[PDB]
RNA sequence: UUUGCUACAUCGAUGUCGGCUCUUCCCACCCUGGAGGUGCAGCUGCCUCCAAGGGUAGGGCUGCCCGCCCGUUAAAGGGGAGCGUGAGCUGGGUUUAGACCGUCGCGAGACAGGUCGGACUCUAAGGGUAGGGAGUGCGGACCGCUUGAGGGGAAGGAACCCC
RNA sequence: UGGGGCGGCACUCCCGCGAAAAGAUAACACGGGAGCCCAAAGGUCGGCUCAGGCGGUACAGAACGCCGCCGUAGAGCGCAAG
RNA sequence: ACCCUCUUAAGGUAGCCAAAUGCCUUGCCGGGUAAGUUCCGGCGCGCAUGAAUGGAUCAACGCGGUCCCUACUGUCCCAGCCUGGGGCCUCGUGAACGCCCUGAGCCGGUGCACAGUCCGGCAUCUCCCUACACCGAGAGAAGACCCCGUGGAGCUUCA
RNA sequence: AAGUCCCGGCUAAGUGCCAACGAAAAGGCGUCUCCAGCCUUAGACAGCGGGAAGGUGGGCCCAGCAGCAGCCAUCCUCUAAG
């Protein structure tokens, strides 16, 4: 489904599991790549400059590409880090009756229209949160820009890098 | 769905009660004055005292004092234009001002 | 090689895999597509939704499973080619939507195949169906080969060595690309094939099957190849 | 341009599928015209950009629409107009009353399942359109010859053959 | 009653949330319950301290009884939730 | 093919079939056609065939349903010419329906969401005759469909 | 009806001449502006002629890859030059 339906607010924070039954596995299962606590020079962030959701779909994609072209520089262990900071707790329902259920003249329409869980997001509620940040040496910062940028446009949500 | 409507519903926070004011009535000095007639009080309910409790709708409302039945009060507080009489045990009241 | 078996009905898919002469099942399974009976609506415009629908739900789950058993084998190159058959429509509409990864979808060997069971037997079926098929698809790099080696014995550049003594003084060098040695058992072509692999050069065994085989045998005396560089 | 969701308009009625007839429009370009790239030698291909002036046909099967197929073609593109058009036709489909079958129901009866039979009203106040006659104005009554603001056009399009 | 039908019961009653820190507040909204059980599981008076862990003891074992140390409740209070 | 058990007594025999009965479904193979979702033959995973609730079966008969061939043709390619009666022009007789109004050219909008009348434009000299029916959400009938009413009527039965 | 009103700037598309009413991610040093950091008369950037390199084209593997085909080090005849 377009990522157009569930990248606003649309009601509460929806994350209690207890209440909540059948939840899909999220596809992001890796949250920290490389080797941290290596000696690295440069600390660049990757900020995000709205308020809105990001599925883990959109999460996975941009972690995978940041991952292959960091990894096709020079190795995987050596002095690099990546780290996704933001975890998918939130709960996005889809009204799917209008699939199945609303053509057996069962409660077909708007009747009975609370939806049923299909994946987690990403809720951020601040200007300015930082979803993702890479550790590399001085040596490095031109093929770390680069990896940002290219993770930047599988995802919702407007953002810069900043060096530090 | 429509809210049931018993004596203790929508109280799961009114009738709390902070971690340093648990147990069996700590405050005896409050229970040492008798209220005369003419006198101003609030209704303060007291969460684990269970007997001669009032309604949430009463909590924090100035009454005046009218009378005395057994060892409760009686005690006339205004709702909205309409004058209430309510009989409440000294452990939910407590002086106003 | 491997070739992809599919047949797909309107509640039913098998998957499989033709490794040589062996027919091997990978996924059954069920889709429960039900009919105008057991509804449900009671009304005529909304109960063919959910015929036309879960029969969609349905082929979505069949295009997913292809995908996981057969993306693996493209991304080694082992697949040459994809079959699917089945009764209906179920096999044009599974084939014509984006149900199918474009790598698979490029894959599939043209015509589809009527086959009426399900199941092992049914797989041999399709195999059978499509003996002509192939027939072509077996033998296309022998063929791409001796039009390349043509082109290059008129041009007269150099770049196709023949003759067993001439051979023999190309492969200790690894200059041969590829050496297609016609079939003789017991002969030196034979013996020559399984040394000249050690170099790195791929190597085709024909015989009589081909027409080609008997221009080979005639002219080079069975035994030709084609250089990566001049020699001379 | 599908299918849903909503229930704003029409219940003292806006005739409800398909086809035929006739007109016009969109462009997201199938062919015809222009330019470029190519893993473009030539022939044939594939792709990108401009462009709606012209074209896009005949049949078998089904009530169809879609679709499959036959012989050709430069190509036999895809959509809108109250799913354009029943005071133009048709009446195969569908939704009355009659009847048969299967399943269901104690029954009367039901199906969204199959099958046979089943009505198509009207003399055009107004507008529009296609043509044909008089009047007043310019400009006192008449005969004759003209110009060329304006308006419309596709008036032509395409293929095959020779060198 | 997001047409009616089929379904469900949001048709009597109770808890949380919806509910926006007084009061009131809707949805075929979400998470669930009651239609009883007890002569004690009721009344009063007295004594005691629970779950869990640590050290020492034949059978003895994570979990029998005994001797000590800690333990704000992490137990129990008929049955949903507070 | 044989034996044991449960629903509830038994467990579809002879035959027939994708049937006027088969959902899937244009079932599969063959025939007929250049090309056959219909038709014929065969098969039998028969959703849901079957024995006076009558099964199989067609001699003769049918203003019954369907498919194919020959002959024949204006049904068509693709229309043309001719004839009788009307229409057209004139004399006599002499109605009916539409009608807030006479103020109704059209394009884009506004607005309960498709205006003759409102807004912005572009147009527009007056009258008469024949022909056409596209628009006036054209005329004709307190919608038969659908829902509601603590409205009916006829039928049924285990109300 | 009332300003072809005044000052500082921008836009070349008829963009625009829209309170409620009609456009996103991405690309543009097209042009206009503000912050960083780094080189500049001890001659910057760009350009132009030359030196534009030598033991050695060292090499392992190789008929040969004589940087750049499969792993890789790393030494001065030197000074206005590598």
């Known amino acids: 489904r377009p990522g157009r339906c569930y990248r606003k607010f649309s009601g509460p924070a929806y994350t209690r599991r207890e209440y909540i039954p059948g939840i ?14 290596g000696d690295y020079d440069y600390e660049l962030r990757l900020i995000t400059t709205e308020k809105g959701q990001i ?48 053509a057996d003249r069962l409660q077909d329409g708007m009747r009975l229209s609370f939806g049923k869980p299909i994946g987690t997001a990403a809720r951020l509620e601040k200007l300015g949160e930082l979803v993702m940040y890479v550790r590399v040496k001085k040596e490095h910062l031109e093929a770390a820009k680069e990896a940002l940028k290219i993770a930047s446009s599988k995802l919702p949500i407007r953002t810069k890098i900043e060096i530090s | 769905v429509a809210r049931s409507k018993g004596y203790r519903s929508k109280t799961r926070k009114l009738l709390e009660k902070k971690v340093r004011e648990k147990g069996a009535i700590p405050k005896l000095s409050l229970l040492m004055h008798d209220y005369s007639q003419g006198e101003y009080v609030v209704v303060k309910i007291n969460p684990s005292i269970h007997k001669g409790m009032p309604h949430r709708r009463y909590h924090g409302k100035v009454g ?10 009686e005690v006339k507080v205004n709702i909205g234009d309409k004058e209430r009489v309510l009989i409440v045990r000294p452990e939910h009241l407590i002086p106003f001002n | 090689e491997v070739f992809g078996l599919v047949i797909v009905e309107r509640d039913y898919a098998t998957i499989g895999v033709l490794k040589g002469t ?14 105008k009976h057991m509804m449900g609506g009671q009304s005529q415009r909304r109960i063919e939704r959910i015929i036309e629908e879960m029969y969609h739900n349905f082929l979505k789950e069949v295009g997913e499973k292809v995908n996981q058993y057969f993306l693996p084998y493209i991304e080694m190159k082992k697949m040459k080619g994809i079959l699917i058959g089945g009764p209906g429509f ?22 589809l195949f009527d086959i009426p069971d399900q199941g092992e037997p049914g797989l041999k079926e399709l195999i059978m169906k499509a003996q002509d098929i192939l027939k072509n698809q077996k033998y296309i790099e022998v063929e791409n080969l001796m039009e390349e080696i043509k082109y290059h014995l008129a041009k007269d550049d150099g770049m196709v060595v023949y003759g067993l003594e001439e051979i023999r003084k190309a492969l200790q060098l690894g200059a ?14 034979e013996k020559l094939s399984q040394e000249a692999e050690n170099y790195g050069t791929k190597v085709y065994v024909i015989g009589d099957e081909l027409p080609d085989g008997e221009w080979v045998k005639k002219t080079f ?9 001049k020699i001379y």
């Open chain 1, 24 to 37: 899909p596995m999220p596809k992001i299962t890796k949250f920290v790549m490389g080797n941290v606590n």
């Open chain 1, 55 to 102: 599925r883990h779909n959109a999460l996975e994609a941009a972690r995978v590409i940041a991952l292959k072209y960091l990894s096709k520089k020079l190795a995987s262990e050596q002095n690099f880090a990546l780290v996704v900071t933001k975890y998918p707790h939130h709960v996005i329902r889809e009204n799917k009756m209008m699939a199945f259920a609303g």
């Open chain 2, 64 to 73: 005046l004092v009218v009378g005395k039945r057994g060892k409760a009060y």
């Open chain 3, 22 to 35: 062996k027919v091997e099942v990978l996924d059954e399974f069920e889709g429960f597509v039900p009919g």
């Open chain 3, 90 to 111: 179920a096999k044009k509409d599974l084939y014509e939507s984006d149900l199918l990864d474009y790598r698979v979808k490029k894959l599939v060997l043209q015509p």
């Open chain 3, 176 to 189: 041969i690309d590829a050496l297609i040695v016609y079939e003789e058992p017991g002969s030196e072509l």
């Open chain 3, 221 to 229: 005396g069975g035994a030709i190849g084609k250089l990566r560089f």
